[PDB]
């Protein structure tokens, strides 16, 4: 009944199908190399992940 309606809409292959690892966001996601992080969350973790600015 309700369990068959609650959260019933498909939530795959979409922008709402995925989220940031750190800030559960839907906008500004980075999917390269399987990061799955918001673009804002990436900046605050880039040094920790191993991404540095050289050029």
């Amino acid at each position: 009944a309700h369990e068959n309606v609650w959260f019933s809409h498909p939530r795959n292959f979409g922008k709402g199908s995925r989220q940031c690892r750190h800030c559960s966001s839907h906008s500004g996601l980075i999917r390269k190399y399987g990061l799955d992080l918001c673009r804002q969350c990436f900046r605050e973790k880039a040094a920790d992940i191993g991404f540095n600015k050289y050029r």
């Binding site: 990061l35 920790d48 992940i49 191993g50």
Partner: protein, 165 residues
């Protein structure tokens, strides 16, 4: 499972970033400095640097044992595949992480900013730092916010050496 070379090195990096913040939230009060992940055959050595190595292994190492179990249950690691060691930072004054966390525990005690700020300027130099500068920004009883700067000694600003020293 089968992970490409480009994504596998990234996954190891992503693992470090998420693990480091977990320690920052849990072991903030023990002057957590940083973490070193020493991969090895048949074991995953993890080295945590903290100001206080009594908290991290409390009550017959209750905390480190109950804390290493929290990592086996979240990353689906074998129970024997990870071992956590707590190592003392030798020179606390040269670690800005310890000095900033130490500052937080004093500011939250209602202590004046000036007493807290001069407490880290002199503590860093005593450990032998070439220079140190502390900036504190925010609101304190007053509605308007302000930022203060206490410099000391020699500080460099531009180029590669800021990433080195």
């Amino acid at each position: 499972a089968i992970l490409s070379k480009k994504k596998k090195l990234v996954a190891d990096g992503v693992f470090y970033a998420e693990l480091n913040e977990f320690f920052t939230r849990e072991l903030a009060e023990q002057g957590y400095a940083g973490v070193e992940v020493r991969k090895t055959p048949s074991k995953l050595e993890v080295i945590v640097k903290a100001s206080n190595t009594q908290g991290v292994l409390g009550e017959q190492g209750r905390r480190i044992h109950e804390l290493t179990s929290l990592i086996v249950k979240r990353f689906k690691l074998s129970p024997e595949g990870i071992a956590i060691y707590a190592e003392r930072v030798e020179e606390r004054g040269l670690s800005a992480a310890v000095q900033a966390e130490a500052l937080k525990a004093k500011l939250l005690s209602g202590l004046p900013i000036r007493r807290a700020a001069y407490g880290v300027l002199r503590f860093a130099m005593g450990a032998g730092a070439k220079g140190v500068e502390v900036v504190i920004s925010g609101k304190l009883r007053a509605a308007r916010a302000k930022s203060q700067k206490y410099a000391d000694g020699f500080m460099i600003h531009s180029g590669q050496p800021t990433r080195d020293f």
